[PDB]
Write a protein that binds this ligand. Structure first.
Ligand SMILES: Cc1cccc(Nc2cc(Cl)nc(SCC(=O)O)n2)c1C
Ligand SMILES: Cc1cccc(Nc2cc(Cl)nc(SCC(=O)O)n2)c1C
Length: 263
């Protein structure tokens, strides 16, 4: 409970979007600057005009939507990986890890953490983008050509099963820290120091859930399973991005993300 509060602090401090902010928009007004809704190329075109005006002047609307939606995804992945880094530095004992240990835990935990947190900004109909000023629909996303249609569906699939657990952000902050401090990660130099960390977070997490959701007895074991799915989800996800990199003409990877995929 003592450790929990600081992780819940670091969580709120370091992420521009959270479940409360996201439901505020997904649930309704949001009376000022309401999300643009994106269901087709026309509204996609409308949103770019408003939001990324510099790009539109640069001629991006000549490119197919599959590629602009994909480059939009990378930019957000890059925003979040930066936020995930600053968040980890605020988890106790993380800064004290050897720097190669710090670099390693983040290489493997971020896409798992990204996908878990993505669930907070989704409902069955769609997901928020552009810092809450855009809402792109799941169906427009399925409308897109292969392999581009295949990226978001597995994550929408998880989000509904995940959002159904009805976690609050205090839950999610401990959950995201635990993903990060996994000691099973390859290439670690000081595994005991790190396993020692995971042992701590998971205790407070087991304890917070017990208090936060006294009614849901099976919630904790259910969450541990959620961690395994994300690894597979991330593994399958990686397989898809490799297919796109070798295959699609304008699917350039961002350099930061390219560092993530080296192993
Ligand atoms: C969902 C959404 C909201 C706002 C703008 C856009 N269009 C974008 C966004 C980004 Cl980050 N990049 C592009 S094209 C980039 C390039 O020429 O490499 N197009 C999109 C796809
Ligand atoms: C918070 C948020 C909302 C929407 C999209 C994303 N980034 C994603 C999500 C998914 Cl399922 N796929 C991609 S493709 C490029 C990449 O490998 O980061 N990018 C993120 C990080």
């Amino acid at each position: 409970k003592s450790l929990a509060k600081r992780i819940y602090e670091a969580y709120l401090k370091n992420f521009n979007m959270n479940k409360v902010k996201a439901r505020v928009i997904l649930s309704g007004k949001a009376s000022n600057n309401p999300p643009f809704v994106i269901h087709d190329m026309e509204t996609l075109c409308m949103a770019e005009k408003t939001l990324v005006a510099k790009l539109v002047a640069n001629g991006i609307q000549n490119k197919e939507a599959e590629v602009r939606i994909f480059h939009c995804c990378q930019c957000t992945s890059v925003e979040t990986v930066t936020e995930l880094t600053e968040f980890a530095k605020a988890i106790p004992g993380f800064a004290n890890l050897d720097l190669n240990d710090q670099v390693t835990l983040l290489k493997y935990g971020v896409y798992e953490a990204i996908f878990a947190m993505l669930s907070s900004v989704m409902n069955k109909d769609g997901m928020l983008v552009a810092y809450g000023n855009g809402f792109i629909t799941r169906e427009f996303l399925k409308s897109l050509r292969k392999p581009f249609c295949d990226i978001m569906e597995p994550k929408f699939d998880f989000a509904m099963k995940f959002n159904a657990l009805e976690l609050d952000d205090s839950d999610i902050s401990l959950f995201v820290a635990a993903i990060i401090c996994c000691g099973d990660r390859p290439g670690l130099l000081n595994v005991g120091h790190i396993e020692k960390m995971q042992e701590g977070i998971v205790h407070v997490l087991r304890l917070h859930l017990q208090s936060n959701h006294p009614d849901d007895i099976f919630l904790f074991p259910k969450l541990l399973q959620k961690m395994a799915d994300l690894r597979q989800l991330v593994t399958e996800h990686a397989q898809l991005v490799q297919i796109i990199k070798k295959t699609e003409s304008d699917a350039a990877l961002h350099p930061l993300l390219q560092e993530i995929y080296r192993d």
